[PDB]
């Protein structure tokens, strides 16, 4: 079986690169993020323009919703993270405290806590209440690339320019893996599958790999796009067949059988490199977002 995603909106406005798209657990909204300082809101069914929030200093690299859909992250070259309350645009807290660009951000699915990757090759967990730091793990000696909570909160993985990948106990700090295969590259992205028994790597020798984590195994590998250059977003897809999806710098977004390896789709339309996808909570939708030369967001979807 393959899927069937075709373009259904083109989504302008930002004006200068975008860097992250998310959708909102409940599935009514998208949030992107640009390298223009703007947070900005969309319809997630039919792509309409909803609000532009507005308040960081520089670029945005990442941006991460609440588990209610109510709160959004944002990570910023600005060297601060802020919380922002979606429905009345207020920044709520302003995360201070990494000492170069914050590149990731993510809640815990409890949404009590914020976790942050950046340049100064450290991992942060914030207080979403106090907006306090928490913790400093000296998780890498490179930029870290991404971070994401596990489904229970309980764990926190992140990667590197280093090439690693580690695990670390959300509640204590503690480094409880670090995962390395037969070479090293940069690891450009990391996120758990959505059980959580897996992690999905990306590296800059333009390879995808499922790692069984508890196993410290690679048990699958994605090949066939382009990434040797750039950090991009990754997903599981699972409300229809399932696959993985990922963006790629020959501007496609690049989808794969999770199981045969093999690519089930290519689709075409986006002009510069496809630094951002995200799929949808419960339809077959697909959001994808593009660096400078082409700013625009696009959403795609599927009967399948
Ligand atoms: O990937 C890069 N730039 C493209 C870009 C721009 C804005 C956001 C992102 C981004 C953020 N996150 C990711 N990519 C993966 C997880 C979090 C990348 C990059 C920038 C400086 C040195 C090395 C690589």
Known sequence: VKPNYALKFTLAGHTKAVSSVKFSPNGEWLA???????????????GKFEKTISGHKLGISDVAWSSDSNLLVSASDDKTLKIWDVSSGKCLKTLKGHSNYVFC??????????????????????????????????????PVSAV????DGSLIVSSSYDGLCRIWD????????????????????????????????????????????????????????????????ANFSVTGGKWIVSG?????????????????????????????????????????????????????????
């Open 32 to 46: 992107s993020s640009s390298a223009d300082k703007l947070i900005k809101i969309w319809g997630a069914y039919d």
């Open 105 to 142: 951000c993510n809640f815990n699915p409890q949404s009590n806590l914020i976790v942050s990757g950046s340049f100064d090759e450290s991992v942060r967990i914030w207080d979403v209440k106090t907006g306090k730091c928490l913790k400093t793990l000296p998780a890498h000696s490179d």
């Open 148 to 151: 994401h909570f596990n489904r």
């Open 170 to 233: 959300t509640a204590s700090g503690q480094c409880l893996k670090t995962l390395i295969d037969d070479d090293n590259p940069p690891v450009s992205f990391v996120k758990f599958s959505p059980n959580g028994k897996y992690i999905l790597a990306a590296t800059l020798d333009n390879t995808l790999k499922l790692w069984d984590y508890s196993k410290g195994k690679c048990l699958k590998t994605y090949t066939g796009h382009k990434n040797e250059k750039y950090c991009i977003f």
């Open 248 to 304: 790629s710098e020959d501007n496609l977004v690049y989808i794969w059988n999770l199981q045969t390896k093999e690519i089930v789709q290519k689709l075409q339309g986006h002009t510069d490199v496809v630094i951002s996808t995200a799929c949808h909570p419960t339809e077959n939708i697909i959001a994808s977002a593009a660096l400078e030369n082409d700013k625009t967001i696009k959403l795609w979807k599927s009967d399948c």
